[PDB]
Amino acid sequence: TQPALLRLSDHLLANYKKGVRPVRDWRKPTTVSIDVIMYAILNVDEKNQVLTTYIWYRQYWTDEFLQWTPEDFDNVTKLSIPTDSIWVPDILINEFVDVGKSPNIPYVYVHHRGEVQNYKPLQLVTACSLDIYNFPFDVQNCSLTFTSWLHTIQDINITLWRSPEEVRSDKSIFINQGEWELLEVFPQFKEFSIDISNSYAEMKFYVIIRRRPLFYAVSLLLPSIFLMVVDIVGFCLPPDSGERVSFKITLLLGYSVFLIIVSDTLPATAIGTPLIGVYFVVCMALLVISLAETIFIVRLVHKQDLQRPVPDWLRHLVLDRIAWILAVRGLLQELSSIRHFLEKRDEMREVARDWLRVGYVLDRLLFRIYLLAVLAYSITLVTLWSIWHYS
Amino acid sequence: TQPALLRLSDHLLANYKKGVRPVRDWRKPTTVSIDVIMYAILNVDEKNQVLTTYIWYRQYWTDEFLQWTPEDFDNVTKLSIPTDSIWVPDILINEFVDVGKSPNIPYVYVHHRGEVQNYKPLQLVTACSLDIYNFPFDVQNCSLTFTSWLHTIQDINITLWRSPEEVRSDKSIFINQGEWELLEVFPQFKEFSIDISNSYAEMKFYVIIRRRPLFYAVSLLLPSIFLMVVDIVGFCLPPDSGERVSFKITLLLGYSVFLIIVSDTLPATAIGTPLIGVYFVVCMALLVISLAETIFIVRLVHKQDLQRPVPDWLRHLVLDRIAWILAVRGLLQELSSIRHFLEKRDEMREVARDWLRVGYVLDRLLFRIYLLAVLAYSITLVTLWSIWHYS
Amino acid sequence: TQPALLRLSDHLLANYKKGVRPVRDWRKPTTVSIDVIMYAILNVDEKNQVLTTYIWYRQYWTDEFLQWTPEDFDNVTKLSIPTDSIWVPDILINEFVDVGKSPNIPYVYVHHRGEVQNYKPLQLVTACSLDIYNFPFDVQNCSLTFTSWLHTIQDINITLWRSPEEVRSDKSIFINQGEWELLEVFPQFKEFSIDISNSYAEMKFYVIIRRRPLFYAVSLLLPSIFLMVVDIVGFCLPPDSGERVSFKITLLLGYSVFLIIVSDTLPATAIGTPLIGVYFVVCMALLVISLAETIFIVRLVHKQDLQRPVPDWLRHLVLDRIAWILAVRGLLQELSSIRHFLEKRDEMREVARDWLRVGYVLDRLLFRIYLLAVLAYSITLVTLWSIWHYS
Amino acid sequence: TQPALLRLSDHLLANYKKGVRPVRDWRKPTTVSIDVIMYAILNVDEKNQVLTTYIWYRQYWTDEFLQWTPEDFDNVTKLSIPTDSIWVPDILINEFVDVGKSPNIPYVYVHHRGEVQNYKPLQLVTACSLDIYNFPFDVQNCSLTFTSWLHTIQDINITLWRSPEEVRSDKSIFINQGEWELLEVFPQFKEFSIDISNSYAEMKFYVIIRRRPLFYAVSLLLPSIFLMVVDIVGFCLPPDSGERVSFKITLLLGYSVFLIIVSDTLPATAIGTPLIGVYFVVCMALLVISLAETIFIVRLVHKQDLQRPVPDWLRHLVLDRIAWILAVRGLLQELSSIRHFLEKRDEMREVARDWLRVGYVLDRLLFRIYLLAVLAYSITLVTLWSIWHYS
Amino acid sequence: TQPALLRLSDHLLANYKKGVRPVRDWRKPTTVSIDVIMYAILNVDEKNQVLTTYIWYRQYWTDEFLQWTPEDFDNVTKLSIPTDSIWVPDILINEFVDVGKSPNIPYVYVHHRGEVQNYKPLQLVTACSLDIYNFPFDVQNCSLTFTSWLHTIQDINITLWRSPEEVRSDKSIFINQGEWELLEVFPQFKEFSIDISNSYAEMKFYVIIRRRPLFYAVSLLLPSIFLMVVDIVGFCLPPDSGERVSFKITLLLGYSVFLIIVSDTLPATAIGTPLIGVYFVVCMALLVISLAETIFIVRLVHKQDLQRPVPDWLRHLVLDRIAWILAVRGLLQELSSIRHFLEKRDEMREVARDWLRVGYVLDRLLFRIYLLAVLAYSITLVTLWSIWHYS
Ligand SMILES: *[C@@H]1O[C@H](CO)[C@@H](O[C@@H]2O[C@H](CO)[C@@H](O)[C@H](O)[C@H]2NC(C)=O)[C@H](O)[C@H]1NC(C)=O
Ligand SMILES: NCCc1c[nH]c2ccc(O)cc12
Ligand SMILES: NCCc1c[nH]c2ccc(O)cc12
Ligand SMILES: NCCc1c[nH]c2ccc(O)cc12
Ligand SMILES: NCCc1c[nH]c2ccc(O)cc12
Ligand SMILES: NCCc1c[nH]c2ccc(O)cc12
């Protein structure tokens, strides 16, 4: 003749009358507090300006109608009832691309003082700002908010329930060996108002996401230095052979088709410009001026219709090397004619030989100038790595 | 012995009887007003003729059955009740590709005068018209409507509640650094009727979306001028060497394979034709006539079976340069035979030399003509940029 | 003391008892009529044999239990009640790949005679037959049906409510500047029966969809004629130079890699064969026989181990051109030896010159034959365009 | 004063009490019968080991609580009631990748004997085994089951209601001109038990799916024979010209890049190996040995540092062709010196000519051997087609 | 006058009062046990750090309110009631990317002792850790948990109901011929607590997934050895011909474009580095040094401006081969001049011949050194296969 714990349950849930806002006085606003912790973060998308994450969520509010004494009710401090019976205030996240899918988990906590608690899992894919001005080391300053969509300041109040330093520095749960890592989150309470006499409660959390370069750094540094060092190899073969310019245009077309297929994949943005992309344009212009001096050296060496060398080429090159390091009479007539033809042919051959020599000398000089250019390239890389190492 | 605010709630919600249209007289139509503001806009698709956006939505109507005095009911002006109990008129958006996903947020406002309000978030992906006749600077004149699907003029009335200038010029909420930016929206109220005596209420909002070129302008202007300037480099090597035409067909195949892989990605439409695409066809025809004059210069220079030069080539070129800038007798017989063979060989060599010279002269002339063509290309680009800068 | 319009509502909805089929006599079948209009059509898929569309839907039936007089009930002819209370017969569409998503719009019309109406939006993505035998101008004869899934002939009757000519010719709502355009729809009422004594009602609508070629016609006609006309350019350079066959295999590999990447995209079918695809195979075989005659002309000209020309080559070519357009004695001995060597060398040179000449003559002849082949190609294109212009 | 047909309806549905298993005796198991017919089959996926289909489904069971006489109840044999009120046993399909989407169609049949029927449409995408050992002609032996997930043998009994031959041979509904065609389905009733005293009812249907080669057979046979016959063309040009090996490596790289891009698309599997894929490896090795003999013939012909021919090359080749088909004395001294130099040069030229001749002879022989290899290739193709034609 | 089995059903379900936690004493926690078996596993994704699987799930708990005697209640031991009426505790899986879709199957078991059972199918796609340090043979140590989200230790208790060895070794159901195979699962019960006095129950199952290499092993080993053995073929042609370096850069560009398109597909990770990828970089550097020695041999052989050979090249090579294996006077003057010119020309020709000889000797030596390098490559492959065969 003694009922179970459900006696208190149907004593409370007899006339709860959900759908009305539970207050003793309507002027006093109820308080629902916010708390968010980030369990994990999934992949982002730079095309859609969007990112995915999985955070654990918890909140509580004062229900104000559930009052019972701990004595003579079999010492009951807390119990479990479904969330469909209890009035639940709406805490809505903005800038979402779709509604977050989640299990129902229809259970909430209660307390004898009237405080009710709700622990729910909710994940969100949301669109916010991001920059790619430094793509290996980006700040990724995104924001996600928790506001009341339908209600005002005067009825719903949002607090923290924790110290802001404890929320700011919390690394209890986070999955490692991922591409992205957070260091801190930042709570902020600002009031939101579009027009006069309509101010709504808003709680904003700022996340800072650090991407770690381990794999894409090697995958970006390897093919550029690879094709540059095979270009350094491919300068060495002599220029009067015609396969050098075909080699270099083969290398140029290969670097072009590789540069097109890789620039759309990893910095896949519509508006932002990476710092590495202009560096690629500098590499393209450097390959272009290399092709231009190759064309010039190929043009400078030829064997047909070459005249005498100008004396300013001869005077400068010798200064460059020192700072660098009847049956008897008729037959004689025709034999002199044959000698004249052979002498003209050998004279043309010696002129072509001298043009080949001065072309070889200028080719060696311009190769050493390009080596100094590669040294400046390496100094730029070392300075960039030293700045990012100092941080 | 004094109840809470729920006394007014179950005084109102005792016999509300949802599902019937609440009027005192059925001839008088109720008024539901429209209001829309655009928080953000996501990406579009040119293939599916569709676009995505996220707008904040709000509306109100007269419920006509909820009447209570502010005096003696504890000064209650407004309160919150779920939207499932209240009759909600259907405001449906057309030309949608799927139903818009959204949270339920089951709460509405009421007032003592009978006016009820509903604030709901709804996003929409909808299919409308777009043109690509100017792809960097497009108008993007799309339309999205708010009509009553099931009801008529005579029962549901749609108004604005705001000035049309205030709706037309409103930039309170919009996310920056995106690819698309709106400048104004345009409200319009037109009646919709398919047959006789059936007119339905329709409210149409016209959006104008301006795309900003920052990244794709550089990404479209850089490779075309890049391959044209490396072609300008690649004209310089002499034509009698056979690697020039191989260089040019390598450049042509590279430009072709690049032009195919990039034309399907960014102007990804099935019907519309961009203005930049015909410009690409002009570039292809210009590269074709460059390849044609290259083939002509390669054909014009040869060393085997070349006859005497025609005098119209010789007369025109000298005018072009000035406006441009027994044991004793038998041995003599065989020696004369050897002289005859050597003289014939040297005569053929001199003829081939003259053909090489006139080919070189015509090659220089046609190169300068192509330089004038590049100047006309640049004048066209400067005129186009000047028109788009004047706007 | 006078109630509102809800008095008639709860006079009707007191004991409606949904879920039972409303008839006075069970032998008499109720009639639900069909009507469909096509607002818009979205993209199709040739891979999945499927297509998407958005049609406006409407239907009505006799509810037979709602009877009230217009007099003394405040002149009420029609009113609105939710569709969840009213028995709704199932009109199901077949050959669907998934359930169509749509808003609930839970409202229906009633009338005092008992006729109830329901206006609902429903879109459908459905799988049906299509052919690509003429891919620019296809018929696209698809079918979509409206049958009763669960009920029979004897209980549910399907009529039209409109003239079949008015349904057949109706262009009130359709979006323009799309890839697809319909000209007519065709209603048809056929009985459906799998076994004996089980006949079900079926209403079938046949849609005919005309695709308009504006963009893909240019995008398909431009690169083929482009590579053919650059081949016409590339025949001109002399064949004894070795870069001609490298040019032609470069063009052949480029046309092959372009033909592979474009044939999988636009005619993306698993079974059907387009008429344009065999035309591409004819183009490939024509490029192959061009490469074959190029290889033959390259083989026919050589300078080492060439014998005397056969007289059938010499007799045919001269007919082709006319219809086309001691110290004194020993030194003499060794000098005669040197003369013998030089005479042998010049004889071999003259033989190689004659082989070069006859190769050049045959090359010009075969080039003119290929020009006649291009004329036959153009006649085929003009005949095809004339047939499709006559229609 | 005479009610409608709903009198029998609320006589039956007063105390039906859904959720309890309807039996008069709990020891007697109720029988729910199975029946499945395949309306259509959609595409499959070889990567995800999964396939899609659309089957029509029907089943019935004995409800045992609905008993009414046909007399004095207005001759009612059958009527329609919603499926939410009637107890529905769970018939669940296994190896599904997601829950099948379907309309609710909430209506079932009843009968006066107590037999209730349910006709529902359900489509399924399910993962099962498949093999690609013969990819044009595969068996595709997949299985799909209908078991009771929650209940046992002792309460739910599964029968057929039709002859197994009539289920095995049924072609009433199937869409033609698709890639896949079934010839028969196979019913099988096996008991399923994991541990002792827990046996569950399982009904398994085995489907056999025949793929028809019309388009991909041509699309697979055309490019291989295409590149082989253009290789047959490309053997013909002389080997001492250097463009032959460049031609052949161009063809080899083109065939390699085509073979990579096509082998990942159509036989897109992770584990299974097709028979056509090893055939492609045989083609690659054949192209490799062709490139190897090409390199050997290019190496065998050279003009610098060639010694005398070995006599085993000279003896074998002549057997191969027959079975195949003071001022007076000093000037004489220097003239003899010039004769010595010219004689040495002509001797070296004749040696190089003989090496060119024997290289040409061996090239013709190896070309005819490769022609015999192409004949063996064709015999293999004819034998394969003859076996698949005999079947 | 004797009711059916539903008498016990509405004797039990009269006042069950769902939503309250059923206990006689609130201090005593109820026990819900866990059990999981893996029916099948679908594909994984290395990009999203996620994997898909389909497991069969079962659990039971003590309901504590359903008590009835087997005698006089018609011998009823167990019966079936819907799961919506019975209180169901929440067992939630973490690190999920979306909610798992599943049928409702709303039926549970009961027993006369009070024990209720629930058999439900649930599949899950979840994100966990994985490594690619050995991509053909990986451990794939993933974890999936079963915790109570809302409740504590003090109210919900999780046990096993089976021996841990029987759970660890269970291969009753698993689909074969897949890419992945499990060998064991590992249960573990650890307590989960974020702050003080809040400890929650957690049950963790560790799965170990072994991937089998059959197809991708051949698909990865075949093209690398293929291009290396065609490089071994392509070393053989003489280096003074210019097509060798064009051949090798054609092979290098083909291997580069193949290496780029295949490295993004199969090891598609953002952070992890495979062991095969560095092996590919070693192959690229080996091809680079092969191209470098090819460029060196091409540079070493030339015919213009070659001086006398240095004696250290001549002394080392002869040691390398042995360990390896008036009208009368004027005409005489001009004839001596012609002899001087011919002697100079022949001297230059002999010097160029000697340079060609020493280049050929060094080329053969470096080819044999590269053959020893290929032997070291093969020894590395054999050692790797021997280690993975020993395991
Ligand atoms: C599209 O196909 C349907 C059938 O697939 C055609 O319908 C036929 O129409 C003729 C005359 O209207 C009837 O005699 C046939 O019985 C119909 N066939 C069937 C199976 O019902 C329809 O005519 C086709 N449309 C066009 C434009 O040709
Ligand atoms: N802060 C809740 C969003 C919000 C503020 N003002 C609003 C006005 C209209 C609307 O739909 C939404 C809002
Ligand atoms: N304005 C609501 C659309 C509309 C107007 N007339 C209609 C007729 C039928 C239908 O399904 C829809 C409509
Ligand atoms: N409206 C066609 C319904 C239909 C006809 N025969 C059928 C057989 C089985 C089934 O589930 C459904 C059907
Ligand atoms: N035959 C229904 C599947 C099945 C058999 N035994 C089972 C045990 C547990 C479970 O969840 C499912 C099953
Ligand atoms: N083990 C249940 C998850 C859990 C433990 N502590 C929590 C705190 C907050 C929260 O949202 C979730 C949790």
Task: Give the gyration radius of chain E's Cα atoms.
Answer: 40
Q: How far apart are CA E113 and CA A185, in angstroms?
A: 52
| Ligand 6 centroid, distance to E149 Cα (angstroms) | 6
Chain D residue closest in CA terms to C328 = D328
Count CA atoms closer than 13 A to A191's CA, side-chain side.
Answer: 11
E149 lines ligand 6 (CB under 6 A): yes
The residue length of chain D stands at 391
Tokens of C227: 């590579």
Listed residue (E368, E378, E363) closest to E228, CA to CA: E378
8 Å CB contact of C237 and B94: no
8 Å CB contact of B261 and A256: no
Q: How far apart are CA D293 and CA D303, in angstroms?
A: 19
Whether E53 and E97 have beta carbons less than 8 Å apart is answered as no
Find the DSSP H helices in D235-326: 243-263, 275-300, 311-324
Q: Which ligand is nearest to the CA of C129?
A: 1
| Ligand 1 centroid, distance to D194 Cα (angstroms) | 55
8 Å CB contact of A95 and B214: no
* Nearest atom in ligand 4 to D58's CA: 11
**Segment B214-218 long-range contacts (CB within 8 Å, at least 24 positions apart):** B214/A271, B214/A273, B215/A269, B215/A270, B215/A271, B215/A272, B215/A273, B216/A270, B216/B136, B216/B266, B217/B136, B218/A273
Whether B177 and B125 have beta carbons less than 8 Å apart is answered as no
For chain D, say whether E328 makes contact (Cβ under 8 Å). yes
Q: How far apart are CA C267 and CA C317, in angstroms?
A: 49
Tokens of C16: 């409606």
Residue list, ligand 1 pocket, CB within 6 Å = C 141, 206, 208
Q: Sign (positive/negative) of CA torsion D6, D11, D12, D15?
A: positive
* DSSP 3-state of D26: coil
- DSSP letters, E264-284, are TTTT--SS---HHHHHHHHHH
For chain C, say whether B21 makes contact (Cβ under 8 Å). yes
For chain A, say whether E14 makes contact (Cβ under 8 Å). no
Whether A201 and A208 have beta carbons less than 8 Å apart is answered as no
Whether B104 and B47 have beta carbons less than 8 Å apart is answered as no
Instruction: Please tell me what resolution, in angstroms, this structure has.
Output: 3.3
**How many of the other CB atoms lie within 10 Å of CB of A252?**
21
Task: Give chain E positions within 8 Å (CB) of A58.
Answer: none
Which helix (H) or strand (E) is D351 found in, with range? helix D327-390
Within chain C, strands assigned E span 30-45, 50-62, 80-81, 108-109, 115-127, 141-147, 156-157, 180-193, 199-211
Find the DSSP H helices in B130-274: 164-168, 215-234, 243-263
- By the 10 Å C-beta count (0-12 exposed, 13-18 middle, 19+ buried), C312 is classed as exposed
Tokens of D166: 């009539």
Angle formed by the axes of helices E275-300 and E327-390, nearest 10°: 170
Whether E111 and D155 have beta carbons less than 8 Å apart is answered as no
Whether E173 and D94 have beta carbons less than 8 Å apart is answered as no
Q: Which amino acid is at C68?
A: W
Residues whose CB is less than 8 angstroms from the CB of residue A191 and which lie 6 or more positions away in sequence, other chains included: A153, A199, A200, A201, A202
| Ligand 5 centroid, distance to D150 Cα (angstroms) | 7
Count CA atoms closer than 13 A to E214's CA, side-chain side.
Answer: 12
Question: Any bridge partners for residue D210, and if so which?
Answer: D181
Listed residue (C49, E53, C98) closest to D124, CA to CA: C98
Q: Compute φ and ψ for E338, nearest 5 degrees.
A: -60, -40
What's the angle, vertex CA E198, arms to CA E193 and CA E203, rounded to 5?
50
Whether E117 and E60 have beta carbons less than 8 Å apart is answered as yes
Q: Please identify among residues 122-151 of chain A the ones whose CB lies closer than 8 Å to any CB of chain E.
A: 123
Whether A273 and B214 have beta carbons less than 8 Å apart is answered as yes
**How many of the other CB atoms lie within 10 Å of CB of B223?**
17
Q: How far apart are CA A103 and CA E124, in angstroms?
A: 13
**How many of the other CB atoms lie within 10 Å of CB of D216?**
16
Residue C142 carries which DSSP code? Answer: E
Q: CA C323 from chain center: how many Å? A: 50
Listed residue (E101, E95, E112, E98) closest to E149, CA to CA: E95
* DSSP 3-state of B371: helix
8 Å CB contact of E299 and A103: no
Cα separation values, D184 from D131, D161, D166, D170, D187, Å: 19, 18, 10, 7, 10
| Ligand 3 centroid, distance to C86 Cα (angstroms) | 21
Q: Which amino acid is at B71?
A: E
| Ligand 5 centroid, distance to D93 Cα (angstroms) | 12
Task: Give chain D positions within 8 Å (CB) of E226.
Answer: 284, 288
Whether B138 and B130 have beta carbons less than 8 Å apart is answered as yes
Listed residue (B55, B135, B122) closest to B92, CA to CA: B122
For chain B, say whether A77 makes contact (Cβ under 8 Å). no
Whether E49 and E127 have beta carbons less than 8 Å apart is answered as yes
Q: Which ligand is nearest to the CA of C153?
A: 4
Q: How far apart are CA D370 and CA B124, in angstroms?
A: 65
Task: Give chain E positions within 8 Å (CB) of D92.
Answer: 103, 105, 121
For chain E, say whether A346 makes contact (Cβ under 8 Å). yes
What's the angle, vertex CA A255, arms to CA A254 and CA A259, rounded to 5?
120
Q: How far apart are CA E240 and CA E301, in angstroms?
A: 6
Tokens of E154: 């003090």
Kindly compute the dihedral angle of the four CA atoms of residues C209, C210, C213, C219, in this order, to the nearest 10 degrees: 30
For chain B, say whether A21 makes contact (Cβ under 8 Å). yes
Listed residue (B253, E217, C323) closest to B245, CA to CA: B253
Q: How far apart are CA E258 and CA D261, in angstroms?
A: 10
A192 lines ligand 2 (CB under 6 A): yes
Question: Any bridge partners for residue A217, and if so which?
Answer: none
| Ligand 6 centroid, distance to A108 Cα (angstroms) | 13
Chains contacting E (3+ CB pairs below 8 angstroms): A, D
Q: Compute φ and ψ for C153, nearest 5 degrees.
A: -65, -40
Residues whose CB is less than 8 angstroms from the CB of residue B123 and which lie 6 or more positions away in sequence, other chains included: A97, A98, B52, B53, B54, B55, B100, B101, B102
Strand order in the sheet with A180-193: A141-147, A199-211, A180-193
Which helix (H) or strand (E) is C340 found in, with range? helix C327-390
Q: How far apart are CA D298 and CA D241, in angstroms?
A: 9
Task: Give the gyration radius of chain C's Cα atoms.
Answer: 40
Whether D290 and D248 have beta carbons less than 8 Å apart is answered as yes
Q: How far apart are CA C120 and CA A345, in angstroms?
A: 97
Beta pairing class for D115-127 and D50-62: antiparallel
Chains contacting A (3+ CB pairs below 8 angstroms): B, E
Count CA atoms closer than 13 A to B152's CA, side-chain side.
Answer: 17
8 Å CB contact of B150 and C119: yes
Most A-contacting residue of B8, B59, B135, B250 (CB-CB within 10 A), to test interface: B250
* Nearest CA, atom 6, ligand 6: E194
Write down the experimental method used for this entry.
cryo-EM
Whether C179 and C40 have beta carbons less than 8 Å apart is answered as no
Q: Compute φ and ψ for D348, nearest 5 degrees.
A: -65, -40
* Nearest atom in ligand 3 to C121's CA: 11
Question: Any bridge partners for residue E201, and if so which?
Answer: E191
For chain E, say whether A246 makes contact (Cβ under 8 Å). yes
Q: Please identify among residues 150-209 of chain B the ones whose CB lies closer than 8 Å to any CB of chain C.
A: 150-151, 155, 194
Q: Which ligand is nearest to the CA of A198?
A: 2
Kindly compute the dihedral angle of the four CA atoms of residues A42, A46, A51, A52, in this order, to the nearest 10 degrees: -30
Tokens of E195: 């702050």
| Ligand 1 centroid, distance to C145 Cα (angstroms) | 14
Of E17, E257, E298, the CB nearest to A6: E17
Tokens of C208: 């005919």
**Segment D359-367 long-range contacts (CB within 8 Å, at least 24 positions apart):** D359/D239, D359/D240, D359/D297, D359/D300, D359/D301, D360/C305, D360/D238, D361/D317, D361/D320, D361/D321, D362/D297, D362/D300, D363/D239, D363/D297, D365/D320, D365/D324, D366/D293, D366/D297, D367/D235
Question: Any bridge partners for residue C33, and if so which?
Answer: C60
| Ligand 3 centroid, distance to B151 Cα (angstroms) | 9
Cα separation values, C52 from A367, C44, C143, C253, D269, Å: 62, 6, 12, 38, 30
Tokens of E193: 């607590």
**Residue ranges of domains in chain B, CATH in brackets:** 1-212 (2.70.170.10), 213-391 (no CATH)
Cα separation values, C67 from B235, C63, C89, C341, D3, Å: 92, 9, 20, 125, 15
Q: Which amino acid is at D162?
A: R
Question: Any bridge partners for residue E60, and if so which?
Answer: E33, E117
Residue found under tokens 């004889």: C347
What's the angle, vertex CA C193, arms to CA C209 and CA C139, rounded to 5?
10
Q: How far apart are CA E293 and CA E282, in angstroms?
A: 17
Longest dimension (CA), chain C: 161
A189 lines ligand 2 (CB under 6 A): no
Q: Which amino acid is at A333?
A: Q
Whether B293 and B235 have beta carbons less than 8 Å apart is answered as no
Listed residue (A86, A81, A27, A80) closest to A61, CA to CA: A86
* Nearest CA, atom 1, ligand 6: E149
Tokens of E261: 């398109």
8 Å CB contact of A175 and E129: yes
Listed residue (B193, B32, B151) closest to C119, CA to CA: B151
Q: Which amino acid is at A48?
A: N
* Nearest atom in ligand 5 to D192's CA: 1
Task: Give chain B positions within 8 Å (CB) of A272.
Answer: 177, 215
**Helix, strand, coil fractions of chain A, as percent rounded to 5:** 40, 20, 40
Listed residue (B216, B191, B218) closest to B202, CA to CA: B191
Tokens of C228: 């053919």
